[PDB]
Amino acid sequence: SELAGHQTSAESWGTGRAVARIPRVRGGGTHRSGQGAFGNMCRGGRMFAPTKT
Amino acid sequence: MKFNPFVTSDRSKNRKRHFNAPSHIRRKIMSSPLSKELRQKYNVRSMPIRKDDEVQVVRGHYKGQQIGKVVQVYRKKYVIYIERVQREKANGTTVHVGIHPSKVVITRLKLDKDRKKILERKAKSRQVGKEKGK
Amino acid sequence: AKIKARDLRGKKKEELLKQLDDLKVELSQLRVAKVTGGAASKLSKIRVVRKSIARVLTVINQTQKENLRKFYKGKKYKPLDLRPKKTRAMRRRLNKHEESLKTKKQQRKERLYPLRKYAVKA
Amino acid sequence: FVFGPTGMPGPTPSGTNVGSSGRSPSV
Amino acid sequence: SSHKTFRIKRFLAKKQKQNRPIPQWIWMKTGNKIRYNSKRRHWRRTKLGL
Amino acid sequence: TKGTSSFGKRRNKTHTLCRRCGSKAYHLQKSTCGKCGYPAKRKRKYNWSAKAKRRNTTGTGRMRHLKIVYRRFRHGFREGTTPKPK
Amino acid sequence: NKHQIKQAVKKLYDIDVAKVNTLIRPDGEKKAYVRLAPDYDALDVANKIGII
RNA sequence: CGACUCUUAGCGGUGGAUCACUCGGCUCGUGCGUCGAUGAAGAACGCAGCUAGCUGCGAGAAUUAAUGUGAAUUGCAGGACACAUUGAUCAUCGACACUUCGAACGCACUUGCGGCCCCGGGUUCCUCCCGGGGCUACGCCUGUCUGAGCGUCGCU
RNA sequence: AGCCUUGAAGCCUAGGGCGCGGGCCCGGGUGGAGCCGCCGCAGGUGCAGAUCUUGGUGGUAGUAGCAAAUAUUCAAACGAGAACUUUGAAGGCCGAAGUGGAGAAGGGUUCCAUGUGAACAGCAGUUGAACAUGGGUCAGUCGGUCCUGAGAGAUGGGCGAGCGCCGUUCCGAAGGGACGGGCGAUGGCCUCCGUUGCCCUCAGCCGAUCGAAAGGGAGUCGGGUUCAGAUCCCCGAAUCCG
RNA sequence: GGCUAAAUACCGGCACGAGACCGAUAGUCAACAAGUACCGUAAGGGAAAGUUGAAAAGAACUUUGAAGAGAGAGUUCAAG
RNA sequence: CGCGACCUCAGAUCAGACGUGGCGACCCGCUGAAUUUAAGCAUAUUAGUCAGCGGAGGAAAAGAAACUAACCAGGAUUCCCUCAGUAACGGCGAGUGAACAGGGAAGAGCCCAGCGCCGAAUCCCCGCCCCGCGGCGGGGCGCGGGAAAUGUGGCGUACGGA
Ligand SMILES: [Mg+2]
Ligand SMILES: [Mg+2]
Ligand SMILES: [Mg+2]
Ligand SMILES: [Mg+2]
Ligand SMILES: [Mg+2]
Ligand SMILES: [Mg+2]
Ligand SMILES: [Mg+2]
Ligand SMILES: [Mg+2]
Ligand SMILES: [Mg+2]
Ligand SMILES: [Mg+2]
Ligand SMILES: [Mg+2]
Ligand SMILES: [Mg+2]
Ligand SMILES: [Mg+2]
Ligand SMILES: [Mg+2]
Ligand SMILES: [Mg+2]
Ligand SMILES: [Mg+2]
Ligand SMILES: [Mg+2]
Ligand SMILES: [Mg+2]
Ligand SMILES: [Mg+2]
Ligand SMILES: [Mg+2]
Ligand SMILES: [Mg+2]
Ligand SMILES: [Mg+2]
Ligand SMILES: [Mg+2]
Ligand SMILES: [Mg+2]
Ligand SMILES: [Mg+2]
Ligand SMILES: [Mg+2]
Ligand SMILES: [Mg+2]
Ligand SMILES: [Mg+2]
Ligand SMILES: [Mg+2]
Ligand SMILES: [Mg+2]
Ligand SMILES: [Mg+2]
Ligand SMILES: [Mg+2]
Ligand SMILES: [Mg+2]
Ligand SMILES: [Mg+2]
Ligand SMILES: [Mg+2]
Ligand SMILES: [Mg+2]
Ligand SMILES: [Mg+2]
Ligand SMILES: [Mg+2]
Ligand SMILES: [Mg+2]
Ligand SMILES: [Mg+2]
Ligand SMILES: [Mg+2]
Ligand SMILES: [Mg+2]
Ligand SMILES: [Mg+2]
Ligand SMILES: [Mg+2]
Ligand SMILES: [Mg+2]
Ligand SMILES: [Mg+2]
Ligand SMILES: [Mg+2]
Ligand SMILES: [Mg+2]
Ligand SMILES: [Zn+2]
């Protein structure tokens, strides 16, 4: 799917918070909040060079 | 080989339609071959199994020549319960062991008007095919 | 002693109402039994008397609607619920007569120049 | 004849916080 | 509050009734997977928002 | 005192439940729903939130009447007939 | 409402009602406190209904 | 001596990798291509003998009728004088039914106030009270009725 | 005419080996159902790092700590079990701007009875606002309900591509009412009165509607009663409105 | 001023078929009571979570303990 | 003054109808950026694209030349191939960029106003009779009502027509 990995509003915390600069899931109150997103090294992200039809 | 474009041979689809089959379809899936004597008498090969039928277990731990009455057709679990095909629990109470209908042979049929109608229809469609080949 | 719809079909409206009343009284007693220690047999009867109530009401409602349709059959204007449902867009279509209409100009053209059946030699 | 299970849900915490309790400034 | 609207008291009453453990005969059902009511709510641990 | 101390003063609800969409997004002072836009006749819907459109689109609910239409369509929306009686 | 409750009780059990008090319970049900006229004994009536 | 420490190995833990499974996805292709004031989509609250959720249904409420099917459903109980042209169950679905809000429609949105017509019970013709039923929204087309104008006139 | 329930993959192994190496073979164990060689094809194909992602686990470490608001002690009971529960007795504290007795907002069953002592209540618990099983909120008179407030908001109108917006008396034929009178029609305790239709007569309100559980706004008090409700239940005595 | 089928389009819907695709940190967020639980006043944000066994045969009974837990015993090809 | 026509305009819980909201992959009409590229940046590009608003249908839109051409001519619309990264546009930079012809898929053509002739020859609704009646229509009969000469119907429309 062309949406896989992208159906989130993740945003990078930026430097200074002692974490890598990968974009992170917003909000709180669930396991998903503050996790990595989008990048191909992330669980639940988008794969590298998604295959095309 | 299958050629019908509207019949799926997909494994996932065929298992899903087996395990979600409605009650009146599980009845047809729960069919047993007839004995050699019954098969000759009626010209039918298989019948859907029914309560009060008398069967022989031909596979598993309980196989043998003993004929027992069908006491319960548990279509939800896809098994039948047969007289004397049972074991004991830890507390000593006896519990029926489920046998799949495809692993028994019907020696005597529970006959009523509807069953005689179903046997007749099966035997007639068979003869139409035999004359078609002949 | 069970209630079947086939039994109730010919019964008059008054009998069904009386038959309905007996069931409703019986259900009320059962709901009292449900809370005052009734037997499992009485609890199981609750569902049977409920569906019996539904059967009688179903036959009363059906008997009434058939007569209403006979009453309004030849009438120009009918209650909205006796008019065909179909879908909203289908109810707004040009009806059968309106779609078949043609201008006299179109009728004359089709009379004078009908499409012919022909073949061309190979 | 089983009556053992139990459970109770609650909010999942989140640790998106920043202390920042100092400054030099020491230009 | 004691001062309540009928609509609020009706919403609260439904939340009261959902807040029970599952019947224990659900466990013996043929294809059952549910072990407990995973939607239990505690008036102090998590709030209704209304 | 903008943190912990100020959080103790909040005891006045801004929103309540909405009679149309049933979400606690009905602004009481503005008499408007933040979610569905009630009392506007048309439903509030935007294309910058695809996730929000799939949370309340047709299909997510009960389909009380639409799914009977899907069944009736397969027989041409026939009416006023019954199967031939036994 | 109370008027409807009163008329239903009279017709269902052929008794007479002095007054009716109602509340809606925390579980959403409505409870009716129906008082019978002084010439009817609730204990006797409860026996007919099957309460006691 | 013996602790402690380190290395290796057996066994035991902690942990849930791996592997095998897949009633799920994803992609492509085909046919059809159908919502609503006859009240949609959506939302709320209810409904099971034991039932919280999911699922289904709407006070006829885990469903009625009909048709096909042909002996079950099932976790437990029960069997209505449920059970074979006195039809279990499932399926189909054309009959009937379908609470509250919602374009949402008497006015408001608190389960607040009405108005008109008819019906039933109190009473005792009207009134009055209670209950039931039917109506009472905006725009707009055709026509109908009732009107308006120091608009144009005709006869008086 | 590969392997495999006479045991596949996977995993483990101070077993025997091969290869410069990437790796691979065999032995033994566990495992329980599939797998591999060779010629070709294809690729989401090889990790030590990226303050990499997600999950798990360490040392630190039985360590920091469990020190704000003066304080506990004796006996007995239940109980397997008591510094912490209950009863009794002491010694203390809050000291009527209370650590007392009642409400508003908010909560939403936390309330009450009984039971449990798994998890939770940063020691424990025989206890709890935990868990489980059942109960509990009664009104003409107490509030809402009605009024208008600051304000909000339709219609007419205006503007606007348009969803719509402005505006609240402003570019409006904005009254569906009435004492009475005259013409009829229907009924009934048919005497004569109602109701009802039309006409005459009369008519400022001038702004739909919403807006307060602290403002305006008629009228309920005494006693008793429950495990939990009472100006609501029962007893008695009243009162407003229609 | 006006009407007009066909060949064309179709990541929504109803119903189907297939694949050199992925195989539970993958593939849809969602293989499961998932747009759920949970967070936010709100607009919104949004997971984790698959596998006993062929068959429940899911361990009767004895014994220590207040119990959790144990020791025996038993089911199963296997509870290694 | 009264009565009566017409015109313009009102009120009706008047008789019978119709619109509203949703979904929105594809379609039509608007409105409409900025990240971005130009190694800066303002024109330009991004892009008539995202976002925003309206309206549909099973398809939509378009469509039977006020066309292309300049040939020995073709002949509605839509789509595919090619024309063609071409003619052209462009701080003539970065970049952008069609058409005709040709080969195919499909193939379908028509109707008014006007100018005229026909005694309005036309239409809607109500009431009764026959037929049908879950797509509300066919025929007959009303000195029944209205619309319509401020123009309905038939013939006829550029390929000419009467
Ligand atoms: Mg992924
Ligand atoms: Mg013509
Ligand atoms: Mg709190
Ligand atoms: Mg505010
Ligand atoms: Mg329930
Ligand atoms: Mg039925
Ligand atoms: Mg049947
Ligand atoms: Mg109010
Ligand atoms: Mg080793
Ligand atoms: Mg296996
Ligand atoms: Mg791959
Ligand atoms: Mg790796
Ligand atoms: Mg690594
Ligand atoms: Mg220490
Ligand atoms: Mg206090
Ligand atoms: Mg107190
Ligand atoms: Mg503790
Ligand atoms: Mg308490
Ligand atoms: Mg406004
Ligand atoms: Mg008010
Ligand atoms: Mg007030
Ligand atoms: Mg009193
Ligand atoms: Mg067109
Ligand atoms: Mg997983
Ligand atoms: Mg996943
Ligand atoms: Mg994992
Ligand atoms: Mg894996
Ligand atoms: Mg997961
Ligand atoms: Mg695993
Ligand atoms: Mg083993
Ligand atoms: Mg009307
Ligand atoms: Mg630049
Ligand atoms: Mg640059
Ligand atoms: Mg720049
Ligand atoms: Mg520019
Ligand atoms: Mg441009
Ligand atoms: Mg857009
Ligand atoms: Mg729109
Ligand atoms: Mg629309
Ligand atoms: Mg459509
Ligand atoms: Mg054109
Ligand atoms: Mg063309
Ligand atoms: Mg070229
Ligand atoms: Mg451009
Ligand atoms: Mg061309
Ligand atoms: Mg062709
Ligand atoms: Mg003309
Ligand atoms: Mg032309
Ligand atoms: Zn809303």
**Per residue, what are the HEC states of chain F?**
CCCCCHHHCCCCCCEECCCCCCCCCEECCCCEECCCCCCCCCCCCCCCCHHHHHHCCCCCCCCCCHHHHHHHHCCCCCCCCCCCCC
Tell me the resolution in Å: 2.7
My answer on whether omega of the bond before D25 falls inside 30° of 0, hence cis, is yes
Cα G33–Cα C45–Cα C4 angle in degrees, nearest 5:
120
CA separation for the pair C51, F26 (Å, rounded): 42
Q: How many angstroms does the Cα of residue C3 sit away from the middle of ligand 6?
A: 13
CB within 8 Å of B126: residues ≥ 6 apart: B43, B44
C-beta within 7 A of nucleic chain J, residues 1-27 of D: 9-12
Reading the block at residue A49, the tokens are 């060079």
C-beta within 7 A of nucleic chain J, residues 35-54 of F: 35, 46, 49, 51-52, 54
Q: Any atom of strand J under 7 A from CB of A30? A: yes
CB within 8 Å of G20: residues ≥ 6 apart: G2, G5, G6, G9, G32, G33, G34, G35
F19 to chain E: closest CA residue: E7
DSSP code for C71: H
Reading the block at residue G21, the tokens are 């008090």
CB within 8 Å of A7: residues ≥ 6 apart: F50, F51
Q: Is B95 helix (H, G, I), strand (E, B) or coil?
A: strand
Contacts of G49 in chain C (CB under 8 A): 32
CA separation for the pair C68, C82 (Å, rounded): 8
Q: Could you give phi then psi for residue C69, rounded to 5 degrees?
A: -65, -40
DSSP code for G4: H
End-to-end Cα, chain A, rounded Å? 10
CA distances in angstroms from E3 to B85, E6, F12, G28, listed in the order given: 67, 10, 15, 16
CB within 8 Å of B132: residues ≥ 6 apart: none
CA separation for the pair G44, G52 (Å, rounded): 9
Q: Is E49 helix (H, G, I), strand (E, B) or coil?
A: coil
Please answer yes or no on whether D16 and A34 come within 8 Å at the CB atom.
yes
Residue from C35, C34, C26 nearest C53 by CA: C26
CA separation for the pair A22, A38 (Å, rounded): 8
Find the DSSP H helices in chain G.
2-13, 42-49
Q: Helix C13-35 crosses helix C40-71 at what angle (to 10 degrees)? A: 150
CA separation for the pair E41, D7 (Å, rounded): 10
Q: Could you give phi then psi for residue G24, rounded to 5 degrees?
A: -105, 125
Q: How many angstroms does the Cα of residue E22 sit away from the middle of ligand 17?
A: 29
CA separation for the pair B107, F69 (Å, rounded): 49
Residue from C86, C82, C85, C63 nearest C12 by CA: C63
F56 touches F71 (CB < 8 A):
no
Find the DSSP H helices in chain C.
5-8, 13-35, 40-71, 88-91, 96-100, 104-112
Nucleotide nearest to G31 (CA to C1'): I138
Q: How many angstroms does the Cα of residue G27 sit away from the middle of ligand 23?
A: 63
Nucleotide nearest to E15 (CA to C1'): I108
B92 touches B70 (CB < 8 A):
no
DSSP code for C115: P
Sheet holding F26-27, edge to edge: F15-16, F26-27, F32-33
My answer on whether omega of the bond before D13 falls inside 30° of 0, hence cis, is no
Q: Is B113 helix (H, G, I), strand (E, B) or coil?
A: helix
Q: What is the DSSP string of A29-47?
A: SSTTTT-B-SSTTSTTSPP
Environment class of residue C56 by beta-carbon count within 10 Å: exposed (0-12), middle (13-18) or buried (19+)? Answer: buried
Q: Could you give phi then psi for residue B82, rounded to 5 degrees?
A: -125, 140
CA distances in angstroms from C97 to A25, A51, C101, E50, listed in the order given: 63, 57, 7, 59
| Chain F touched by E14 (CB under 8 Å) | no
Q: Helix G2-13 crosses helix G42-49 at what angle (to 10 degrees)? A: 70
